[PDB]
């Protein structure tokens, strides 16, 4: 979530070790492809047009990027993106906070109840 500086290198090193990026979402849209998205192709596409909207090898995702059925969710955009509203609908089991405080303390309570691993920002985002 958020194809910025952190989000660009996050998907590149995960894709290098066998992980498949199924969706990338920013403030102006979200793409989706369950068969993987090439980080290099999306990086060159983000540079050319300043946005990931309209990626050829992907499809537009008209929904919440944080609620996509997946395994790892990497919030790497703005603050407080996972609150008590959308957190009970998160399908991921691992949440890697690529930003500074993107999960409310109330969402931390139900994330621990739902058995969802939340790697904290003061360690992972360092």
Cα torsion 29, 31, 37, 40 to 10°: value is -30
Give yes or no for residue 106 binding Na ion (CB under 5 A): yes
- Contact map string, positions 79 to 108, toward a second copy, x by CB under 8 A: -----xx--xx----------------x--
Query: Taking every pair of C-alpha atoms in the chain, what is the biggest distance, in angstroms?
Result: 43
Contacts of 18-21 spanning 24+ positions with Cβ under 8 A: 19/72
36 or 88, CB closer to a second copy? 88
Rounded to the nearest 10 degrees, the angle between the axes of helix 5-16 and helix 39-49 is 160
Q: From the CB of 110, what's the least distance to a second copy, in Å?
A: 9
Q: From the CB of 88, what's the least distance to a second copy, in Å?
A: 5
The listed partner (Na ion, a second copy, none) that binds 89, CB under 5 to 8 Å by sort, is: a second copy
71 or 106, CB closer to a second copy? 106
Contacting positions for a second copy (CB under 8 A): 84-85, 88-89, 106
């Amino acid at each position: 979530q958020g194809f910025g500086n952190v989000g660009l290198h996050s998907m590149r090193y995960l894709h290098r070790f066998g992980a498949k990026c199924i969706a990338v979402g920013e403030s102006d849209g979200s793409i989706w492809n369950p068969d993987g998205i090439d980080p290099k192709e999306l990086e060159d596409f983000k540079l050319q047009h300043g946005s990931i909207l309209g990626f050829p090898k992907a499809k537009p995702y008209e929904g919440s990027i944080l609620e996509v059925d997946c395994d790892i969710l990497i919030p790497a955009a703005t603050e407080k993106q996972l609150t008590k509203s959308n957190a009970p609908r998160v399908k991921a089991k691992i949440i890697a906070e690529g930003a500074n405080g993107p999960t409310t303390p109330e969402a931390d309570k139900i994330f621990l109840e739902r058995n969802i691993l939340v790697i904290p920002d003061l360690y992972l985002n360092a």
